[PDB]
């Protein structure tokens, strides 16, 4: 017949490095246009206020 | 003033004072002249607004 009576102390130092990304999208908003135009006039009267 | 009551007179209408767009067998006082305007879809386009 034995008894054993037992105890623990104990440390942990625990150093954690976290990288993350993230890329969000919307399927029906995925781009945005922007146009480079020109007015030309071949014709023989000038126009005013062209739109 | 408009016997076919259309928003021109008799009288541009027989003399020729006219919007010339009106075509020519319109151009007799008991024909009316009036436009007939309907869309027809050419082609649907569907997003889902899903991000």
Known sequence: NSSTVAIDHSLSLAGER?????????????????????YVNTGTAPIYNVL | WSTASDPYSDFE???????????????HPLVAAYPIVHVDMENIILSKNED
């Open chain 1, 18 to 38: 976290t990288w993350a990304e993230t890329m969000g999208l919307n399927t029906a908003d995925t781009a945005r246009l922007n146009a480079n135009i020109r």
């Open chain 2, 13 to 27: 209408k027989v003399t020729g004072r006219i919007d010339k767009n009106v075509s020519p067998e319109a151009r």
